[PDB]
Each structure stands twice: as C-alpha cells, then as structure tokens.
Amino acid sequence: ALPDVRDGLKPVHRRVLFAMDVLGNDWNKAYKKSARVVGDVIGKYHPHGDTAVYDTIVRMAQPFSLRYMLVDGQGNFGSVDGDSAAAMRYTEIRMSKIAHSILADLDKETVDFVPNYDGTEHIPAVMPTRVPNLLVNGTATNIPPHNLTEVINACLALIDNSELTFEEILEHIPGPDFPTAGIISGRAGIEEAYRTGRGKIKIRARASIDVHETTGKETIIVHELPYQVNKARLIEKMAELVKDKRLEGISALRDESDKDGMRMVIEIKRGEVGEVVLNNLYKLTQMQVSFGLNMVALTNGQPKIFNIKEMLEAFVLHRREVVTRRTIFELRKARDRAHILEGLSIALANIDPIIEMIKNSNNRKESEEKLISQGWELGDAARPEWLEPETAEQAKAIVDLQLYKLSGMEHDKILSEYKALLDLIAELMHILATPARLMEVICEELVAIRDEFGDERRTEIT
Amino acid sequence: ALPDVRDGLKPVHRRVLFAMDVLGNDWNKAYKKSARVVGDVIGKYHPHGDTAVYDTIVRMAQPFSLRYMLVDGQGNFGSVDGDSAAAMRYTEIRMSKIAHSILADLDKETVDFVPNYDGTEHIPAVMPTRVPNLLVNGTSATNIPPHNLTEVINACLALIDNSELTFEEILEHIPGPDFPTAGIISGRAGIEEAYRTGRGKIKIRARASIDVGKETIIVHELPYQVNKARLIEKMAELVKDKRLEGISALRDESDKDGMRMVIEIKRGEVGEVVLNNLYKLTQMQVSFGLNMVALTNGQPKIFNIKEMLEAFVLHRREVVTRRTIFELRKARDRAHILEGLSIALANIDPIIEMIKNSNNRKESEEKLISQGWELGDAARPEWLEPTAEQAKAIVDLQLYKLSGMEHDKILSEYKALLDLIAELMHILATPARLMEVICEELVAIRDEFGDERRTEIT
C-alpha cells in the first residue's frame, strides 16, 4: 500500500494510532504494555496475527527511523545495528505529544469514518492532522523526512501568497533533513526532485580527524551515518576492505557507540594520511550512499507523483476542510445546547407550578406532555435548524433535571452558560461566513505547532 | 499447567471465558468474531503471538472435543477428520448456555480476583461454577476423561445427604466415563481402580454392526480423540500391503447427520474375525490411562473421585455463603436509600425550599443533615448509627420521580427488599438452609443440562 498524501499514513498506521487514542493511551498518562495496543488493533481493526501491527508500533518509536516519532516508547526497540525490538510483552508504549496533533478534533466530525472488518466499529479514513506528516516523516515511493520548522514556514508563505514559486519554496526548504543527520551534497538533485517528483542526492557521514597530542597519530571518528545505514554491517564491510588490502592506511577498527552517541573509531597507521583514508572510506563503503527521491502518495484513491508545491497544497487544502467541518459541527452543538438551557431557564424561572403535573401524572412519559400541551410563561440565529416555528426535547431536559439544580449558583450556572453560548454561536458564524477569519484560524494553528514542535536542522546541505 | 480441581480450568481457559463474559459475548446475543475475543485475551490477560488462545477457543467449541461445550460457534471449527479451524477473522463465537453457569455470580464477590501480567487489570483465580466441570468435561501430565452431567450431579446430591458415601455407592451413580463421541468401554476394574486411586487403564472400542449376499462392517461411532480420516487411510494401508485379511472395499460415507464407515467382506471369510483384527491393529480400539491430577491451593495432587466431588461441593459451600453475605449487605444499603427517598417524598414541597435557599450542592446536603424531618431494625446497614448518604440520594433525585407511579415504585422496592433481607438472614444462620440452596441449584442444572448416557460400559 501507499500512504495518503494528506496525513501521510498507511491504513495500519491509523488503525494503530486510532486504537491508542480510543484507549486513552495518551502522552501524559502511564505507559501501557505494547501487547495491550496490539490486542485492540487485532481485535477491532486489523484481524490478522502478523507482526505488521507490532512492527508498525516498533518503527514509530525509533528515533533513527522517524524525524518526529509518533510513539513514545520505553524498552528495547532495536538499533541502527539492526537488532530487533524485544517481545510485545516487554515494551511499554504511549502516544507522543506530536501524535495528538495528528489526531486533534477526531471527535468533531472532521474526517470520514468507515466501517471495520465486521461492521461493529468505525475508523477514520484519514487523520485531521495539524502536522504535515507526509513530508515531515517521509514515507512505489521514497519520500525523505523534512524539517518541521521549514515545512510550516513554506506552508505559511504559501497561504500568504498562493502564487509561491518553486524557487521561493527552496529558500524555506533547502532540502531533506534526516533524523540520522549527516551531509547532503547533491544540491541540484534537490531542486530536481522538488519541481519534478524525481531526483537523486548524495548523503555523506559526518567524521572528524583527531591527532593524539603526543604521538601525532591520527584517528578518524565517525559521528553521523547516512539514513538507513546499518552501523554494524558497515564496520564489517570496512574490516573486509582492509583484509583484502582494498583499503590501505588503517591499523584498527572499533565501535564505541552509545545509548548516548555514535563513536566509530578508525585508527590511522603511523605516517599515512588521515584525509586520504577518509576520502577512500567515502568511495568504497556506505559511508556514502545515493537516495532516490520518488514522491508518490494516494490523493483521491489514486497513486500520483507530486511536486513539492502540490504536497504543500494538499496539506493546506486538508486543513481548510477539517477546520470548516469542525466549525460546522461546533455551531450545530452550540445551538442544541443553547436550546436545552433556554428550555431550562424559563423552567427555573417558574419552578413551583412545574413541580406538580409531575405529582399528578402516573408515569414519566405522560408527565412531559403536560409541558408540551400547556403553554409556558416567562421570566433568532440560535435556534437549531431541526426546530419548527413553535418541545419534547426540552421537557426531557426538565423532567430529567436533578433536584439539586434549583440551588442558587446552579441556576446562575445554567444561564451564564446559556448566555455564553450565544457569544459562541455569533463567533462561530463569522468564522464560517468569512474565508479570511478561517485562514486566520489555520495560520494560528500552524504557528502553534511550529512553536511547540519546531526544532533545528540536523543534516548539513553542501 | 494443570486445571484447578474446583472449576476444571487452566489459566488460558479461564482467561478466555472471563474475556467473553466481560465483553458481553452471551449465549443470548449476537455472535462476535473470534478475532475480537482473541485480541482481548492477548492484550489484557495473555500476551503471546501464540495460537494457544485461538486453539483454546476452537477446542471449547467442538462437539467431538467436549462432553458439554463451553463455546457456541458459527463457522468452520474443524472436524473428527482433523481439518483445521478457519482463521479467527472468519469464525464467529459466543458463550454457550452452560458456560454462564460456570461463571454465575462472579459479580457478587464469590471468588478471589488477581492481577493480570502487569497491574492495570484484575482476573478471577477460579470460577464460581455451579457445574462440576473437572469431571464433566475432563482434562488432558493429567488425563481425566469426560463424564455424564446427570450422573455426577446425582453423585453430589447423594454426597450431601451422606458424607460417608462409599466408593461402591458412587459407582452406582457414576459407573464410568461418558465420552462426547459415544463408544464402548470394557474393563470395569480399571474404572474402579482409577476411581479409588487416581490411576487406572481402560479400553475404548468403536461400535460397529455386522450386516448379513455377503457381509459388511458398519462403524457408527469411534473411540474418543481418534481421527476418522487418519483411520480409514490406516485401514487402506493395511489391506494394500496385505497385512489385513478379507476386505473387498472401504468407503467413508459419514455426513452432517452421522458417521457411517463401511468395510465390505470379500466372500464369506467372516466379519466377526475381521472386526477383531481390526480392533487389534487400528485405532478402532485404543487404551486410556486415567491419571487424575489437579491443583488445590497450588500444588498438584492425585485425587480419588470422592475427593473430587468433595472439592466441588466444598467450593459450592464457600461460593454460596459469600454470595449470600454480599446480597444481604447490598440489600441493606439499597433499602436504606429507598426509605430515605420515601421520607423526602410525602415531605417534598418543604424539601424543595432548602436546595432553593442554597448557593451550592454541598450546602444543600448540609441542610438535610442539619434538620430532623417528619415521617408519613435488622434491615439497616452496619455502618449506620442508631442520613447523609440518603440525602445524596435526594439532592440528586430527578424531577420526574415526584410522579404518581415513580412514587409507588420506590415504595414497592423498599417493602420487597425487607422480605429479601429477612430470607437472606435465614440462609446465612442455618447451615442446613444453605445446603438446601445448593441442592436446589444442582437439581436446576441437572434439569436443564443433564442428558442421556452416550458411552456403553461392559
């Protein structure tokens, strides 16, 4: 499968995340065992028995895999050395802070829900992301990760001026940014893939030469490797090139890497040239690789090659749709709550005669009719739309009202809210009526996420 | 692992049934996909990418596996011919009726719960089973064969009327196992040795008839646990290598409604002798080693049948006593709220006024427990001095409850709850009255689930 261009996810990815959201498996709350989440996924959404689900969980918690993890996990989840994560019975998991911004407003009829494999539960067909995840974590296809700050910037620049040229896009996004860092060098390959959808670049490892102060001996220290390069396979390919005399000048190889940092160690035979050895390392091993940017995603059920402006367009169109649906929904809800409070405020303004008719009725069904059949004394854009020019719904709210509601501040609470709901409806319609207030809301959301999640660039571009 | 001697279940058995009960997968309601149950078990009570769980589920639903099925399934769950079940995403499940009887009163603090693999969830250590599942459904080391529910229940009634019940008297109610697959047992000594000791060996024959024109052997039922497909092919190998006598042909004409293995006899050469070399060279006859072991306080143990009935009845003594303690305590509290609700009513209009005249709910309450109203013993909760709680039930009572017949139902319930706590006391104080309730229960499952003996003992 291919991921959706709007939220950047594949079906299994959403099923996992939605499951964690339904479980209250939040970033503030206590970690839950991975098994638990795998259980609800298999149970309600991916009825299979594989390790697709677990692998998906594992992949989303690896900092060397995602430029912005979606899963905050504790325990053994593998390494750049390619070792495996421990069993689902032994890893703890929970959503990451940024993952919630991808699920924001799921409860406000923002995206279409579909039925699950048996028709007893439903799943969003797409996430209401405030984050341009597809570009940011990257993803036939081969889209590399990017920097959240740069992408939001392009997004803002794009809302302020839709005629944005590719050249301007590049001032904002100079190129990819891997979680793994490194150095990109294929500068025209970047623009190539941005205007076209297809390009090829060179990713190089970061390395420095130390000179031992007393022996003058040289050592090369590899700090950063290119995206996806297995560190241990790389030291093996290196040991080999030394064995076959295909790589001269090295007297010793060691990994001294940590849970805290990478430290590959390549000793330089006395007299040989550090720089030259480094240059030969870059020609014979995965110290250097090619990356083919081939940017395909599903737009409206179909594979498509995208240029970078289109990717930015898709994300922004999707934000217009989610914010619009969100506001439609909030306005319907506010009118329904306003209608019930109103019905309770005249009820509370004459609570004593209201007391009988409850006394004089022989069941609850019939109590109510004495309220829809007699007409009450007292003491518009806020009317629900399902509401006829003249109800049962209100009487349910009175007849089912708790005795303690007559209390002084309760009364005052059910009418400040009522009153506050009338400002809400007013505010809500401005936003829907006015294209500008709406884009303004979208712009504050983008600035908000850029503020909370924006970070430095990691990969250097030469 | 071994099964608990009280409910006859192993941890996963119990973990699976508890999941279905919690999930509302009742014998009554719509079938759920097995995968919904499997996933719940794995995530909440048994974290393994095994098939132990799905496997536990399929076995519980095979009429040929269990004498009294614990799961009612729809879809392909295998067959006596050895087919696999269909995948868990295609098969449907629900607890069988008798299953609710093994779980009855898990809601009334009858059994000790316990932490699951992490904290976060709790699960029963045993089921409050009104069914002696250990014997009735048996267990597979350990190797306890199934038995007839009607026979075991009677062995229990008898044990209740006389705890000096002899082994000899037990044999009259339970002459031996009763497999879901019928068949014929031979060798009574094995049965008596095993019942008295915990270890015995018996022989289990298929039931076949010989039709007398030549002769043909018709097999109607096979010994327990033998695969029909493996068997016919075994017979075919024997006749093809000429290691087995006068058989002109063999067909399996078994269908949805019953078994019919047919073996035709060459021409004379007599079927009574072919049947015999057939019992001797194939799974037409198999032997069964009774080894009745189970846990009791942890720790395996070899049990004699009397000890098994004693364990089950004793467990019923504990469950019912606790269930009654719970009901009594629960009925005192409920009755204490309804008596209040009744004094708030028929003294209402004034009550209205208090909540009226208060800037809060906590203060409405306080002026309920700072008044003595007007009106209009062994039924009182034990934390009650000679009420605040009753007034929480007032302050939060819904307006429509001041209605004519809502008014009559809190009063009716009150009264009816007074007779129930009285009955509840009679049972807790009188040992004999408690044993009556147990007998009433055994008779009840026996009348609903007891059935005809299937296996013949010779």
Coordinates of N, CA and C in Angstrom, one line a residue, chain A residues 33 35-36 39 43-44 47-48 88-89 117-118 121 351-352 355 358-359 361-362 364 398-404 406-409, chain B residues 33 35-36 39 42-44 47-49 89 117-118 351-352 355-356 358-361 394-400 402-405:
Chain A
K33 N 1.5 -1.7 28.2 CA 2.3 -2.7 27.5 C 1.9 -2.7 26.0
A35 N 1.7 -5.1 24.1 CA 0.7 -6.1 23.9 C -0.8 -5.6 23.9
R36 N -1.1 -4.8 24.9 CA -2.4 -4.2 25.0 C -2.9 -3.6 23.7
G39 N -3.4 -5.9 21.0 CA -4.7 -6.6 21.2 C -5.9 -5.8 20.7
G43 N -8.0 -7.1 17.5 CA -9.4 -7.3 17.9 C -10.4 -6.5 17.2
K44 N -10.2 -5.2 17.1 CA -11.2 -4.3 16.4 C -10.9 -3.8 15.0
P47 N -7.5 -7.6 12.1 CA -7.7 -9.1 12.4 C -6.8 -10.1 11.9
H48 N -5.5 -9.8 11.9 CA -4.5 -10.7 11.3 C -3.6 -11.7 12.0
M88 N 6.5 -7.9 22.5 CA 5.4 -7.0 22.9 C 5.0 -7.1 24.4
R89 N 5.4 -8.2 25.0 CA 5.1 -8.4 26.4 C 6.0 -7.6 27.3
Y117 N -13.6 -4.3 9.8 CA -13.8 -5.6 9.1 C -15.1 -6.3 9.2
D118 N -15.8 -6.1 10.3 CA -17.1 -6.8 10.6 C -18.3 -5.9 10.7
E121 N -17.6 -1.6 14.5 CA -16.8 -0.4 14.9 C -16.4 0.5 13.7
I351 N -40.2 27.4 38.7 CA -40.1 26.0 39.3 C -41.1 25.4 40.2
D352 N -42.0 26.2 40.8 CA -43.0 25.6 41.7 C -44.2 25.0 41.1
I355 N -43.4 21.8 39.6 CA -43.4 20.7 40.5 C -44.7 19.8 40.4
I358 N -46.2 16.7 37.7 CA -45.2 15.6 37.8 C -46.0 14.9 38.9
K359 N -46.3 15.6 40.0 CA -47.1 14.9 41.1 C -48.3 14.2 40.4
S361 N -49.2 13.1 37.6 CA -49.0 12.2 36.4 C -48.6 10.8 36.9
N362 N -49.1 9.8 36.2 CA -48.9 8.4 36.6 C -47.7 7.7 36.0
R364 N -43.6 8.9 33.8 CA -42.7 9.9 33.2 C -43.1 10.3 31.8
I398 N -36.0 19.0 31.4 CA -36.5 19.5 32.6 C -36.9 18.3 33.5
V399 N -37.8 17.4 32.9 CA -38.3 16.3 33.6 C -37.2 15.3 34.1
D400 N -36.0 15.4 33.5 CA -34.8 14.6 33.9 C -33.8 15.4 34.7
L401 N -34.2 16.6 35.1 CA -33.3 17.5 35.8 C -33.2 17.1 37.2
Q402 N -31.9 17.2 37.8 CA -31.7 16.8 39.1 C -32.1 17.8 40.1
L403 N -32.7 17.3 41.2 CA -33.3 18.1 42.3 C -32.3 19.2 42.7
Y404 N -31.0 18.9 42.8 CA -30.1 19.9 43.2 C -29.9 21.0 42.3
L406 N -31.9 23.3 41.4 CA -32.6 24.6 41.9 C -31.6 25.4 42.7
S407 N -30.6 24.8 43.3 CA -29.6 25.6 44.0 C -29.1 26.9 43.4
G408 N -29.2 28.0 44.2 CA -28.7 29.3 43.8 C -27.7 29.5 42.7
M409 N -26.5 28.9 42.8 CA -25.5 29.1 41.8 C -25.7 28.1 40.6
Chain B
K33 N -16.9 -11.9 16.2 CA -15.8 -12.6 15.5 C -14.8 -13.1 16.5
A35 N -11.7 -13.2 16.4 CA -10.6 -12.3 16.5 C -10.9 -11.2 17.5
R36 N -12.1 -10.8 17.8 CA -12.4 -9.8 18.8 C -12.1 -10.3 20.2
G39 N -7.9 -11.1 20.4 CA -7.2 -9.9 20.7 C -7.4 -9.3 22.1
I42 N -5.2 -11.6 24.5 CA -3.8 -11.3 24.3 C -3.3 -10.0 24.9
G43 N -4.1 -9.0 24.8 CA -3.8 -7.7 25.3 C -4.0 -7.5 26.7
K44 N -5.0 -8.1 27.3 CA -5.4 -8.0 28.7 C -5.0 -9.1 29.7
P47 N -0.5 -12.1 26.9 CA 0.4 -11.5 25.9 C 1.3 -12.4 25.0
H48 N 0.7 -13.3 24.2 CA 1.5 -14.1 23.3 C 1.0 -14.2 21.8
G49 N 1.9 -14.1 20.9 CA 1.5 -14.2 19.5 C 1.4 -15.7 19.1
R89 N -10.6 -14.6 11.8 CA -11.3 -13.4 11.2 C -12.6 -13.8 10.5
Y117 N -0.9 -9.9 33.9 CA 0.5 -9.8 33.8 C 1.2 -8.5 34.2
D118 N 0.5 -7.4 34.2 CA 1.0 -6.1 34.7 C 0.0 -5.7 35.8
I351 N -38.9 20.2 51.2 CA -37.5 19.8 50.8 C -37.1 20.7 49.6
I352 N -38.0 21.0 48.6 CA -37.6 21.8 47.5 C -36.9 23.1 48.0
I355 N -32.8 23.4 48.9 CA -31.9 23.4 47.8 C -32.1 24.8 47.2
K356 N -33.4 25.3 47.2 CA -33.7 26.6 46.7 C -32.8 27.6 47.4
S358 N -30.0 27.8 48.8 CA -28.6 27.5 49.0 C -27.7 27.8 47.8
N359 N -26.6 28.4 48.0 CA -25.7 28.8 46.9 C -24.8 27.6 46.4
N360 N -25.1 26.4 46.8 CA -24.3 25.2 46.4 C -25.0 23.8 46.5
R361 N -24.3 22.8 46.2 CA -24.9 21.4 46.3 C -24.4 20.9 47.7
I394 N -31.2 12.3 47.5 CA -32.4 13.2 47.4 C -32.0 14.3 46.5
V395 N -30.9 15.0 46.9 CA -30.4 16.1 46.2 C -30.2 15.8 44.7
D396 N -29.8 14.5 44.4 CA -29.6 14.0 43.1 C -30.7 13.2 42.4
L397 N -31.9 13.3 43.1 CA -33.0 12.6 42.6 C -33.6 13.4 41.4
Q398 N -34.1 12.8 40.3 CA -34.6 13.5 39.2 C -36.0 14.0 39.3
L399 N -36.3 15.2 38.8 CA -37.7 15.8 38.9 C -38.8 14.9 38.6
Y400 N -38.7 14.1 37.5 CA -39.8 13.2 37.2 C -40.1 12.1 38.1
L402 N -41.1 12.6 41.1 CA -42.1 13.0 42.1 C -43.5 12.6 41.5
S403 N -43.4 11.7 40.5 CA -44.6 11.3 39.8 C -45.3 10.1 40.5
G404 N -46.7 10.1 40.3 CA -47.5 9.1 40.8 C -47.0 7.7 40.9
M405 N -46.6 7.1 39.8 CA -46.2 5.7 39.9 C -44.7 5.5 40.0

